[PDB]
Amino acid sequence: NYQELAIQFAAQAVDRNEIEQWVREFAYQGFDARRVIELLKQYGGADWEKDAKKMIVLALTRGNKPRRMMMKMSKEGKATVEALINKYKLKEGNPSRDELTLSRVAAALAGRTCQALVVLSEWLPVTGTTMDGLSPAYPRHMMHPSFAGMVDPSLPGDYLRAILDAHSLYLLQFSRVINPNLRGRTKEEVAATFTQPMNAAVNSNFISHEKRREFLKAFGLVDSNGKPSAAVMAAAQAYKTAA
């Protein structure tokens, strides 16, 4: 008997809290922020912070292939990267958990990466100027995928949606630039490649909700209550009308 036993299973109702746990457990995990920092301290020692700052600059302006970027670089720079590759055992793409990538270093330390964006605005693959041509006064702090780990999910539904839609305007433009895989794919198709790690970082256990909101407030993205800035709201709408 199998037709009968299938309904009884469906009748068990939904344990909303139980499902929530499983989602978070099974969630996409591009990097473990804790392991990344653990490794940086282990390999760098006291110098872990300075090198991490450099690795952010390296990641944000030259990408995630350190041996490739080293070919088209100054004598001084090529020396500094070679040292970093050997000191932190740096790899390319997405390897094992106990491995470090420039992208992972930038992702785990999103608090600084986003502050750095203000300065590096015109050195990024998608400049702040290119972003302004889509939404006036686009928030520079939002111009890196690591931003998502700076979003507080406890924020009111309408406010949270606004932050994410604003962020996704960059994401959409950045994905098209970094990926030649784009031929002429619709906004909905492109979103499918970047929303998975976005939500992953939005809902991750690393950095509390209270602390993540304090960052957004500091960057001038939300007020004391959590109402997103006009710039955010402008970009969120710019995203809905975009293609």
Residue tagged 């993205």 (tokens): 221
Give the shortest CB-45-to-its own copies separation in angstroms. 13
Q: Which is nearer to its own copies, 62 or 229 (CB)?
A: 62
104 annotated as a binding-site residue:
yes
Which of the ranges 4-12, 85-93, 220-228 carries the binding residues for its own copies, by CB under 8 A?
Answer: 4-12
31 annotated as a binding-site residue:
yes
Q: Are 35 and 88 in contact (CB under 8 A)?
A: no
Residues 105-144 contacting its own copies, CB under 8 A: 108-112, 115-116, 118-120, 122-123, 125-127, 129-130, 132-134
Q: Are 142 and 167 in contact (CB under 8 A)?
A: yes
Residue 19 in the binding site for its own copies (CB under 8 A): yes
Residue 238 in the binding site for its own copies (CB under 8 A): no
168 annotated as a binding-site residue:
no
Residues 178-217 contacting its own copies, CB under 8 A: 178, 180, 182-186, 188-189, 191-192, 195-196, 199, 203, 205-208, 211, 215
CA distance readout (Å), 84 to 34, 44, 102, 201, 219: 20, 9, 10, 26, 30
Which of the ranges 85-93, 102-110, 224-232 carries the binding residues for its own copies, by CB under 8 A?
Answer: 102-110
Give the shortest CB-68-to-its own copies separation in angstroms. 11
Collapsing DSSP to helix, strand or coil, 114 comes out as: helix
Q: Are 131 and 182 in contact (CB under 8 A)?
A: no
Residue 28 in the binding site for its own copies (CB under 8 A): yes
DSSP line for 41-69: HHHHGGGHHHHHHHHHHHHHHH-S-HHHH
Beta bridge mates, 100: 90
Residues 31-70 contacting its own copies, CB under 8 A: 32-34, 37-38, 41, 49, 52-54, 57-58, 61-62, 69
CA distance readout (Å), 241 to 111, 148, 235: 30, 22, 10
Residue 93 in the binding site for its own copies (CB under 8 A): no
- Tell me which residue of 203, 114, 112, 214 sits closest to 167, measured CA to CA: 114
Q: Which is nearer to its own copies, 160 or 222 (CB)?
A: 160
In the numeric block, which tokens belong to residue 151? Answer: 């979003």
Give the shortest CB-38-to-its own copies separation in angstroms. 6
65 annotated as a binding-site residue:
yes
Helix (H) or strand (E) holding 123: none
Which residues line the annotated binding site? 28, 31, 64-65, 68, 97, 103-104, 183, 193
